[PDB]
Design a binder for this molecule. Sequence first.
Ligand SMILES: [Co+2]
Lengths: 21, 30
Amino acid sequence: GIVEQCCTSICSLYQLENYCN
Amino acid sequence: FVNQHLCGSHLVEALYLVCGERGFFYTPKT
Ligand SMILES: [Co+2]
């Protein structure tokens, strides 16, 4: 998932925004 | 904004900055 992707690959702030409440 | 390579606690710092007041869920794989 996001956690893993940001660490093994890369991720954007826009992807991270999906985990906001 | 630039793309991110974020592991461990560095990810939840990023989540904190992105989301601010909104809060967030930190949901790693088991
Ligand atoms: Co470190």
